[PDB]
Every structure is written in structure tokens, then in C-alpha cells.
Amino acid sequence: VNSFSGYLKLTDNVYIKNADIVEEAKKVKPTVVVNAANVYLKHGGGVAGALNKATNNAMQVESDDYIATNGPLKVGGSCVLSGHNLAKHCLHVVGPNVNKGEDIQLLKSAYENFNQHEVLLAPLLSAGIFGADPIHSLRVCVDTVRTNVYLAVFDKNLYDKLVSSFL
Ligand SMILES: Nc1n[nH]c2ccccc12
């Protein structure tokens, strides 16, 4: 049993809810929240900007030190950093950004990072300002992630379309 409430069950291991991931993290304090990161961990907008704002910029400060030491992530890659006030850990995952011309086949590699964690609160990778089709992102998630994933989708219209169209 876990703390996650109000989710629709899509599969054995994937759950979905219309929710602001920031407000959900604040309520649950999950072991892992996933950030929709870029390779530079520059948390300007989208999910990353919202998560970072909720940490009062502490996520960005920590991320800048990580990049100064390690250099950029790979598209499809990830790193584990602090969850600050939102979670124990933040898994920063880089999905391909279609608005930069990145290979959508890297979306499966991105979701494979989730399998290193037994339970996660996450957004749909490569959705929103990363430009991919969220219906496709949900299909790759279900067909790739084997651990227990709680997906938070703030847009209500999109949430209803994802559920209604789910095979
Ligand atoms: N699914 C989401 N929860 N919170 C967000 C903030 C920005 C973009 C997407 C989300």
C-alpha cells in the first residue's frame, strides 16, 4: 500500500491523475519525483521550471554544481539529485525535445531510467514544451516502465483525452 490517492489504474504498474505535480509532490513526499529535465539541468519552464520554483531555486543551485562537476547529461539519460522540499530524491530525466529536432526513439531510453526506482511520481516525458505527442509518451511509458509509476497531468483536457484514447 502507498500514499497516492485518486489515480485511475491503467495497467498492473501505471496509474494516472489530473494533478499539478508540484502540489502532488508537496502532499505525498514521494521517495522519487521525476523532473522533465534538459541536458544542462536549466530548469526554466514547463515541469522543470515549476518544480524548481517550488524549491525556491535550490534545485537550480544544486543542478549548477552537478553540471560544473560532471558536464551535461545525455538525451535519454538521467541523474539522481535531492528532492528538496518535494520528495526524498529527484530523478532528472531528459526526454528528447522535438522543438530541438531530437530523435523520438530516445523516449524509450528516457523511460528506462524509471526502472531503477520501485515507485515514482512523474510527468509524461517529452510532453508539454518538449513537443512530443502525449498519447505516444503514455504508450511508451506503459510499454517500457515495469516499476510503479504515478503519472500527474495538470491539463484536465489532456488528461481526459489520454484516458479516453488509452488502449
Ligand atoms: N503535469 C504537470 N504538473 N505540474 C506541471 C507544471 C508544468 C507543466 C506540467 C505540469
Coordinates of all heavy atoms in Angstrom, one line a residue, residues 17 19-23 45-51 122-124 128-129 151-155, ligand 1:
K17 N -3.4 10.6 -13.0 CA -4.3 11.5 -12.3 C -4.2 12.9 -13.0 O -3.0 13.3 -13.4 CB -3.9 11.6 -10.9 CG -4.7 12.4 -9.9 CD -4.2 12.5 -8.6 CE -4.9 13.3 -7.5 NZ -4.3 13.2 -6.2
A19 N -3.5 16.3 -12.1 CA -2.9 16.9 -11.0 C -1.7 17.7 -11.3 O -1.1 17.4 -12.4 CB -2.5 15.9 -9.9
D20 N -1.4 18.7 -10.6 CA -0.2 19.6 -10.6 C 0.8 18.8 -9.9 O 0.7 18.5 -8.7 CB -0.5 20.9 -10.0 CG 0.7 21.8 -10.0 OD1 1.8 21.4 -10.2 OD2 0.4 23.0 -9.6
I21 N 1.9 18.3 -10.6 CA 3.0 17.5 -10.0 C 3.6 18.2 -8.8 O 4.0 17.5 -7.8 CB 4.0 17.1 -11.1 CG1 4.8 15.9 -10.5 CG2 4.8 18.3 -11.6 CD1 5.8 15.3 -11.6
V22 N 3.7 19.5 -8.8 CA 4.2 20.3 -7.7 C 3.4 20.0 -6.4 O 3.9 19.7 -5.4 CB 4.3 21.8 -7.9 CG1 4.7 22.6 -6.7 CG2 5.3 22.0 -9.1
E23 N 2.0 20.2 -6.6 CA 1.1 20.1 -5.4 C 1.0 18.6 -5.0 O 1.0 18.3 -3.8 CB -0.3 20.6 -5.9 CG -0.3 22.1 -6.0 CD 0.3 22.8 -4.8 OE1 -0.1 22.4 -3.6 OE2 1.2 23.6 -4.9
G45 N 11.3 26.4 -17.4 CA 9.9 26.4 -17.8 C 9.4 25.0 -17.8 O 10.1 24.0 -17.5
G46 N 8.1 24.9 -18.1 CA 7.4 23.6 -18.1 C 7.4 23.0 -16.7 O 7.4 23.7 -15.6
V47 N 7.5 21.7 -16.6 CA 7.5 21.0 -15.3 C 8.8 21.4 -14.5 O 8.7 21.6 -13.3 CB 7.5 19.5 -15.5 CG1 7.9 18.7 -14.3 CG2 6.1 19.0 -16.0
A48 N 9.9 21.5 -15.2 CA 11.2 21.8 -14.5 C 11.1 23.2 -13.9 O 11.5 23.3 -12.7 CB 12.4 21.7 -15.5
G49 N 10.7 24.1 -14.6 CA 10.6 25.5 -14.0 C 9.7 25.5 -12.9 O 9.9 26.2 -11.9
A50 N 8.6 24.8 -12.9 CA 7.6 24.7 -11.8 C 8.2 24.0 -10.6 O 8.1 24.5 -9.4 CB 6.3 24.1 -12.3
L51 N 8.8 22.9 -10.8 CA 9.5 22.2 -9.7 C 10.5 23.0 -9.0 O 10.6 23.2 -7.8 CB 10.1 20.8 -10.1 CG 9.1 19.7 -10.5 CD1 9.8 18.5 -11.1 CD2 8.3 19.2 -9.3
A122 N 5.7 11.1 -11.5 CA 6.3 11.5 -12.8 C 5.3 12.3 -13.7 O 4.1 12.0 -13.7 CB 6.9 10.4 -13.6
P123 N 5.9 13.1 -14.6 CA 5.1 13.7 -15.7 C 5.3 12.8 -16.9 O 6.2 11.9 -16.9 CB 5.8 15.0 -15.9 CG 7.3 14.7 -15.7 CD 7.3 13.6 -14.6
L124 N 4.5 13.0 -17.9 CA 4.8 12.3 -19.2 C 6.0 12.9 -19.9 O 6.1 14.1 -20.2 CB 3.6 12.5 -20.1 CG 2.4 11.6 -19.8 CD1 1.2 12.0 -20.5 CD2 2.7 10.1 -20.0
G128 N 4.3 18.4 -23.3 CA 4.3 19.9 -23.0 C 5.3 20.5 -23.9 O 5.3 20.3 -25.1
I129 N 6.1 21.4 -23.4 CA 7.0 22.2 -24.2 C 8.1 21.4 -24.8 O 8.8 22.0 -25.7 CB 7.6 23.4 -23.4 CG1 8.6 23.0 -22.3 CG2 6.5 24.3 -22.9 CD1 9.2 24.1 -21.6
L151 N 1.5 8.9 -12.7 CA 1.7 10.0 -13.7 C 0.7 11.1 -13.3 O -0.5 10.9 -13.1 CB 1.3 9.5 -15.1 CG 2.3 8.5 -15.6 CD1 1.7 7.8 -16.9 CD2 3.6 9.1 -16.0
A152 N 1.3 12.3 -13.2 CA 0.5 13.5 -12.9 C 0.4 14.4 -14.1 O 1.4 14.9 -14.6 CB 1.1 14.3 -11.7
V153 N -0.9 14.7 -14.6 CA -1.1 15.5 -15.8 C -2.0 16.7 -15.3 O -3.2 16.5 -15.0 CB -1.8 14.7 -16.8 CG1 -2.0 15.5 -18.1 CG2 -1.1 13.4 -17.1
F154 N -1.4 17.9 -15.2 CA -2.2 19.1 -14.8 C -3.3 19.5 -15.8 O -4.4 19.7 -15.3 CB -1.3 20.3 -14.4 CG -2.1 21.6 -14.4 CD1 -2.6 22.1 -13.2 CD2 -2.5 22.3 -15.5 CE1 -3.4 23.3 -13.2 CE2 -3.2 23.4 -15.5 CZ -3.7 23.9 -14.3
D155 N -3.0 19.5 -17.1 CA -4.1 19.8 -18.1 C -5.2 18.8 -18.0 O -4.9 17.6 -18.2 CB -3.7 20.1 -19.5 CG -4.8 20.7 -20.3 OD1 -5.1 21.9 -20.0 OD2 -5.4 20.0 -21.1
Ligands
LIG1 N1 1.8 17.7 -15.2 C1 2.2 18.9 -14.5 N2 2.2 19.1 -13.2 N3 2.7 20.3 -13.0 C2 3.1 20.9 -14.1 C3 3.7 22.1 -14.4 C4 4.1 22.5 -15.7 C5 3.8 21.6 -16.7 C6 3.2 20.4 -16.5 C7 2.8 20.0 -15.2

